[PDB]
Amino acid sequence: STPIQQLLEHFLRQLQRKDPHGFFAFPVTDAIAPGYSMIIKHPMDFGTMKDKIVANEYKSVTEFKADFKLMCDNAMTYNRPDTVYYKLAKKILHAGFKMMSKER
Amino acid sequence: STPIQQLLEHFLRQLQRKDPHGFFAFPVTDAIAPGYSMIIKHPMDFGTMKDKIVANEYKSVTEFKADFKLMCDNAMTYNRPDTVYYKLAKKILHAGFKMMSKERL
Ligand SMILES: CCC(=O)c1cc(-c2cc(OC)c(Cn3ccnc3)c(OC)c2)c2ccccn12
Ligand SMILES: CCC(=O)c1cc(-c2cc(OC)c(Cn3ccnc3)c(OC)c2)c2ccccn12
Question: How far apart are CA B103 and CA B105, in angstroms?
């Protein structure tokens, strides 16, 4: 129940609110996205990021952002620009970096 | 705030709870589903069904079911069986038939 665990849970909820349909909520499977596990080797989702917040695995804000950036980068690498998953990733990426940089 | 509006809102919430990702929450567009407007001429969603519940446009349970059936049928007509949207429609269909069968008491 640390001061960082407070801060990252606050950050996560605010980002999860930008994903109302829950595309970033758990891992993408090959059933719904063919070839995903071959193309993306470092998968990331909000679900996984929450499990790391409970298990206290984030030592800094930057470690949280790193995963956040990875999730969005995976989306913008696997999906074409015309897709909803891509566009959502790009918005959410930009919004997330403004939401948790140079603040107090 | 009628006795039918109570009943249909209860029905709607129970079905909407089976669609956590909200694929049935507003109209499908051709941007996300190519050729949808050519294949499906009578689109229906939970959003539209909620607007009709507020504006009291459902005179009976059967009028509600009719739309419910249309939404699910559109899904099972446009999408292939192996897709997420199909399987979700088929579950939601079956759940509605049990929820609103001839035994409503
Ligand atoms: C953002 C991750 C992404 O690229 C993504 C997410 C989804 C995605 C994720 C989902 O749950 C996390 C779901 C919801 N889902 C998954 C299994 N059953 C429902 C989904 O439904 C169409 C699409 C998806 C689908 C095809 C191609 C890419 N994606
Ligand atoms: C169930 C209706 C259906 O068949 C359906 C719904 C969706 C669908 C609907 C959505 O919003 C109501 C959404 C959510 N969305 C779309 C644009 N911004 C969010 C979605 O996620 C990709 C898929 C879809 C997509 C491709 C092919 C069929 N469908």
Answer: 6
* CB distance B27 to B65 below 8 Å: no
Closest-CA distance of chain A to residue B76, Å: 17
What is the CB neighbour count within 10 angstroms for residue A12? Answer: 16
Q: Are the CB atoms for B46 and B56 separated by under 8 Å?
A: no
Helix (H) or strand (E) holding A90: helix A84-99
Dist. CA A88–CA B76, nearest whole Å: 27
How many angstroms separate the CA atoms of A65 and A98, rounded? 11
For residue A25, the ligand closest to its alpha carbon is 1
**Domains identified in chain A, total number:** 1
Interface of A with B in 29-88 (CB under 8 A): 32, 84
Contacts for A9-13: CB closer than 8 Å, 24+ residues apart: A9/A53, A11/A61, A11/A64, A11/A99, A11/A100, A12/A46, A12/A49, A12/A50, A12/A53
Phi/psi region, residue B22 (left: phi>0; alpha: psi -120 to 50; beta: rest), is left
Whether A35 is in a domain gets the answer no
Residue B105 within a domain? no
Residue in the block written with tokens 């999860």: A16
In a domain, B45, yes or no: yes
With b for 16 or more beta-carbon neighbours within 10 A and e for fewer, the B62-85 pattern comes to eebbebbebbbebbbebbeeeeeb
